[PDB]
Enzyme design. Structure first.
Site, PDB file in Angstrom:
ATOM      1  N   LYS A  12       1.669  -4.901  -2.695  1.00  0.00           N
ATOM      2  CA  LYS A  12       0.218  -5.031  -2.830  1.00  0.00           C
ATOM      3  C   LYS A  12      -0.384  -6.180  -2.024  1.00  0.00           C
ATOM      4  CE  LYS A  12      -0.648  -2.527  -7.107  1.00  0.00           C
ATOM      5  NZ  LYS A  12       0.658  -1.799  -7.060  1.00  0.00           N
TER       6      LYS A  12
ATOM      7  N   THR B 145      -4.861   4.620  -5.401  1.00  0.00           N
ATOM      8  CA  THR B 145      -4.312   4.830  -6.726  1.00  0.00           C
ATOM      9  C   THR B 145      -4.910   3.756  -7.621  1.00  0.00           C
ATOM     10  OG1 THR B 145      -2.360   3.712  -5.815  1.00  0.00           O
ATOM     11  CG2 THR B 145      -2.158   6.059  -6.360  1.00  0.00           C
TER      12      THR B 145
ATOM     13  N   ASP C  51       0.015   9.432  -7.504  1.00  0.00           N
ATOM     14  CA  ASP C  51       0.670   9.926  -6.298  1.00  0.00           C
ATOM     15  C   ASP C  51       0.497  11.425  -6.102  1.00  0.00           C
ATOM     16  OD1 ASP C  51       3.623   7.756  -6.283  1.00  0.00           O
ATOM     17  OD2 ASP C  51       1.506   7.365  -5.893  1.00  0.00           O
TER      18      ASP C  51
ATOM     19  N   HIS D 290       3.026  -0.290  -3.611  1.00  0.00           N
ATOM     20  CA  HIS D 290       3.880  -0.638  -4.732  1.00  0.00           C
ATOM     21  C   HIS D 290       3.633  -2.121  -5.019  1.00  0.00           C
ATOM     22  CE1 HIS D 290       7.122   2.773  -4.428  1.00  0.00           C
ATOM     23  NE2 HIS D 290       5.948   3.200  -4.858  1.00  0.00           N
TER      24      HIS D 290
END
EC number: 4.2.3.3
Lengths: 152, 152, 152, 151, 151, 152
Positions: free
Chosen positions: A23, A45, A71, A19
């Site tokens: 990061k 992602t 996700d 998130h």
């Protein structure tokens, strides 16, 4: 229900997800273990994937951004037995809109019994484990028998 | 700006998903519309997909069962633009463990702006719509501009 | 569960609800279909309602704002058979405080089997459906029978 | 946000709601306080309402069953200032499908600042409080101002 | 299930918790009842606790901030029978990341059947109740029999 | 936010928790790792704690049953820095009443950055890691600075 076995390859397919407020932590973690990580297959992602490759030159198979379906793409790969390890640094101090996707992903990592890390401490213990680079037998649900009992 | 355009083919890729208590409802619905559904491509979660195929004889691309990751596989296909219509008869009167997966799936279907029916009435209205068998353009977020902005 | 029927009047009672980030999306949708929407009875939550009537001149029965109870007022009306169509553009990329109210509203719309749209594509499909302007029967749960069992 | 006031009448409009595993608890509570409850206006969800009526003989305005929309009907009444007290014995030891409705109802009761009891202890404290039997003014959010600023 | 009784002491152990947007409302409520609260034992989450102490000079057992675990510390004390009343002003108009901690805390307070107020009106009804300063018997789950059946 | 460090003692304080359907797995897991666990301090929720001590004879500091507050007691201990490792085999295939407690506990474990395992695979990698029996420094949030900013 009925459980069968699966073997995690010596060369693991690792998913890296973080998130925004996490990061930086994932980045440092990755840079600190690059030599080791370079020996495995890396997936991530959208954002996370690009920020890592651009910063370390490593080859990362980037999926869609998390809020856009990344996700669920990762969740699907885990169900298909294509992901062996999940490093997911989610933000425990900020409300996330795709919160159901976050819970769904962790739920699947749990049911398919793969090594999962939601923080640095857990990630370190995992990658520093002696069998991280070896084949490992794990117990997984036997879908075949599961579905069979459903069609009766 | 932030949005672009996608064209849904005349031959729609339809995902059919139903909770146990709503399976009979979906089965009946599918049977009453077998003629039209046969002109399209069908996908479905594990249990649902097999039941339908065995009862109507139609070709259905079955994925994993919902609790085992099937919802995420569907969500992934949707984010990848491989699913054009979603018929998801979830149970509003029963608590399910894969509830986050259910919510996540509906969230993506909303994000990618595709036709979604959660009950028989909505399914009927959608399937009886004129250009349901025609190519139709829908507004979808421009992922390129989105990710690019993320990597500023 | 026992099921009975209800007849949707030709002139539908349509509830229009949109989260802040989707308001322009709903507005634009309403203006595009004004000639059609003018033939029906419109209802909406506080803000959405006023913005529509003030922009299109159409008469709208405005309920309370969602956060303040608007969502539940709509849910109540639906369960009471006073709402025939629900257009609810909730934000799939933003977390809201009245999230439980959002899920509870969509849950009831699912239970009472009325046409429901959470995005533009679904909404377009519904209003273009031939029976959108005709009286049509829908299957609904038989409450009397449902309650009788409860008190059995 | 700006606040205004509302008066809670001496004769209270009470909503009585309970999950199946808590119905017996609510029934007992209602029976030992019948003499007092008979003096107020009672409302309840479908099943709960009928059970109370035939058990105590009191007059209850039964709404729909909770899973079928009863909870939102009660929420609607609260937001409209038609419910003054909420007695909601939800089950903290069993998963409920209408869980969103449960949380939504409780959210509204908080927002509109009305007395709310989720258990027996809180229910007893409330009905034994002086202002339960007489009029009292409470602060509530000013909707007019709220909506005006939104526009 | 199997129940038993517990006796809340005349001198209650009160926990005070509030989300940022509700803090001021909690402050006003505390000072408005300071005379009475002074006769009891007060507990609170981190921020809330210090704000109250500094403003009224009353002694408060401050726990960690809610997001850092304070909600769970309070929940823990409740299940241990160390908290008799919970005043939790959570924000019904603003989602918080520790939302699950909020629900879990409220769930326990319900299970352990202790007076709980989520808004000012409920808090005033409880605080003004006659037996608030008396010993009160409450019904609680019989954990012994409970755990015994489990094994 | 501002971070600081904490040293996990060589002799770890381990919390063992499992949902009913996962109790057997945890049990046999503990038995197979008894020699290692014996050198540490064990904590657990009500039911789980007693079953283990009863079957292995090891000393286990049992808290209350999860549904009765056990999870929150554990979360409290973690935030207080009295728990160093969490083994929580929660059931991903079953809806649990104390679901919020389950999430709150996992959230704190994440926040305080302690090793956490939710399945056998993760539990095995963690317990075999070399630093498991060594003093380890972990990055934790600086509460003092955090609280100070709150009262600014």
């Amino acid at each position: 229900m009925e459980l069968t076995t699966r073997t995690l390859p010596a060369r693991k397919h690792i998913a890296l997800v973080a998130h925004d407020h996490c990061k930086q932590m994932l980045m440092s973690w990755v840079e600190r273990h690059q030599p080791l990580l370079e020996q495995h297959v890396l997936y991530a992602t959208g954002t996370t994937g690009n920020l890592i490759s651009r910063a370390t030159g490593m080859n990362v198979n980037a999926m869609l951004s998390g809020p856009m379906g990344g996700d669920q793409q990762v969740g699907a790969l885990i169900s298909e037995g294509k992901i062996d390890v999940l490093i997911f640094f989610w933000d425990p101090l900020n409300a996330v809109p795709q919160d159901p996707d976050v819970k769904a992903l962790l739920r699947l990592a749990t049911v398919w019994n793969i090594p999962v890390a939601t923080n640095v401490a857990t990630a370190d213990f995992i990658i520093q484990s002696p069998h991280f680079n070896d084949a490992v037998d794990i117990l997984i649900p036997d879908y075949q028998r599961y579905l069979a009992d459903r069609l009766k």
